Amino acid sequence: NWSVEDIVKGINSNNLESQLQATQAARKLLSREKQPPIDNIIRAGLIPKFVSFLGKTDCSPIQFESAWALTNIASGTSEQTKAVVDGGAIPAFISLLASPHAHISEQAVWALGNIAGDGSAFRDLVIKHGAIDPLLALLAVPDLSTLACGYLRNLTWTLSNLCRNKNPAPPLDAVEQILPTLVRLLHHNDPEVLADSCWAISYLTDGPNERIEMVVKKGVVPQLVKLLGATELPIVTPALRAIGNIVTGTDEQTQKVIDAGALAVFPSLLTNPKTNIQKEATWTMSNITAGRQDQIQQVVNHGLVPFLVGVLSKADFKTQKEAAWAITNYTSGGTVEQIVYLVHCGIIEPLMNLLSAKDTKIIQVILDAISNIFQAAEKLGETEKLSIMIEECGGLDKIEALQRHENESVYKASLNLIEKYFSV
C-alpha cells in the first residue's frame, strides 16, 4: 500500500535497503491487475532509476526487482513501452542476458521480446544494440531439452519477434544469424516452441525471393516438411504457410520443398476438415503447379490431381478459387499427356460449374484452362470428343452465356472458343 512518493524517497536515497524495498514495492504496484500506477511511476521519473539499477552487478535482488518493474511497464501500452526504450532500457537489458541468475536473464529476454514486438522500429533498435548474439548464446546448450520449457518459450517467442514485421523487414544479416538456431528449434518437442518457430519462418519467407533463398539455404525445409504433418493445428497452420511462402519463390526453391517430401503430405492437407488448411494447401498447390513440367509431373506421381479435382468440385468457394488457379497453372505449364491425365480425372465438369460465378477473374482463369486443354486436344486431333464432354455436361451453355458477360475479355474468350470448337 506504498504510494509513488514513498517509492521515490526510498529509491533516491542512499540507503541500499530502502532502495531495494522501494524497488520491490514499485514492482508490486505495477503488477496489480486492477489499476496499476504505470503512468504515475513513469511521471515520477523512475524509469531511469530502474535502468541504472539493472547495472548494479553487486546487488542481484535489486536488479531482478527493477527488471521486472521495467517489464511490467514495457508490457503495457505502445506509449509506456516507448518510455522504457527512451530510458535506455534496451542496452541495459541486453547486458543482463548473461546474468548467472536465470530468473533475471529470463526477465531480460521477456522485456526484449515485448519491446521488439512493439513494431519494426523498436525491433531494429534491439537488433542494432546487439541483442542477437547474447540471445543465441542462451540457446547454445548441447541439449535444448535441458532448458525449462517456460524459459525456452520466451526465448523462441523473442526471436520470433525479431523476425516479425515487414515495414521494413528485419535486416538480412540479422536473419542470417538467427536462422541456424531456428532450425534447431524446429527439432524440439514442445508444441509452443515449434509453433513460434514456424511462425517466425513464415514471416521471414513472406517477402522477396532473396529472403526465401536464405531461409532455404539455411536448411529449414526438411524440418518444416515434417511439421507439415503435425497433428497440432497451431503448428500445421504456420508450417503450411511457411511452405506456402517458399513455393511462391523460384522453381529451384520450390524443388527443395518437393525434394523434402512435401507432396506426400498434401493428400491429407487437401482433405483436412479445417477449411482454412484446405484453402492454404490448395493455394500452396497452385504455386507448385505453376512451376516446371517435371514438378507438375511429381504432383501427378503423388496422386494429387484427383484431390485437386475433388476440392474444385466439393469445397468452399474461396478454396475452389485457389483450386481453379491450381488447375489453370497446370494446364498452362503441363505437357499434353499431363493434360490428358487431368481430363481423365474428371476435371471438365467441376471446371464448368464455376463458369457462372460473380468473380470475373475466376471466370478468366477457368476460360484459359479450357483454352489450354483444347490446345492439347488439337495436337491429338481429339478436339471433337472434348467438345462433346463439355456440351454433354452443360458447359457449352455456360460458355455461350458468357458472351453476355459484362467483361469484354470474358466475352472475347467465350466467342473464340465458340468459333473454333463449336463452329457452325
Partner 1 sequence: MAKRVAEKELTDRNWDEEDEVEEMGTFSVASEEVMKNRAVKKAKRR
Q: Which residues bind partner 1 (CB under 8 A)?
A: 160, 195-196, 199, 202-203, 206, 234, 237-238, 241, 244-245, 247-249, 275-276, 279-280, 283, 286-287, 290, 316-318, 320, 325, 328-329, 332-333, 354, 356-360, 363, 387-388, 391, 396, 399-400, 402-407, 410-411, 415, 418-419, 422-424
Backbone φ and ψ of 417, nearest 5°? -60, -40
Q: Tell me which DSSP letter residue 169 carries.
A: P
For the chain, give the residues followed by a break (C–N over 2.5 Å): none
CB-CB neighbours of 334 under 10 Å:
25
Closest distance of CB 406 from partner 1, Å: 4
Can you tell me the distance from the alpha carbon of 65 to that of 53, in angstroms, rounded to the nearest whole number? 9
- Residue 218 CA, chain-centre distance (Å), reads 17
Can you tell me the distance from the alpha carbon of 41 to that of 100, in angstroms, rounded to the nearest whole number? 29
Q: Tell me which DSSP letter residue 171 carries.
A: P
**Helix H segments across 89-217?**
89-96, 102-116, 120-128, 132-137, 149-163, 172-185, 191-205, 209-217
Of 183, 187, 176, nearest in space to 214 by CA:
176
Closest distance of CB 392 from partner 1, Å: 8
Closest distance of CB 339 from partner 1, Å: 15
To which H or E segment does residue 28 belong? Answer: helix 16-31
Task: Choose between 118 and 206: whose C-beta lies nearer to partner 1.
Answer: 206
Which three cell numbers mark 20?
A: 531495494
Task: Choose between 107 and 160: whose C-beta lies nearer to partner 1.
Answer: 160
Task: Choose between 65 and 322: whose C-beta lies nearer to partner 1.
Answer: 322
Closest distance of CB 387 from partner 1, Å: 7
Closest distance of CB 183 from partner 1, Å: 19
Closest distance of CB 146 from partner 1, Å: 26
The number of C-alpha atoms within 13 Å of 293 and in the hemisphere containing its C-beta is: 7
Task: Choose between 99 and 202: whose C-beta lies nearer to partner 1.
Answer: 202
Task: Choose between 25 and 235: whose C-beta lies nearer to partner 1.
Answer: 235
Closest distance of CB 331 from partner 1, Å: 10
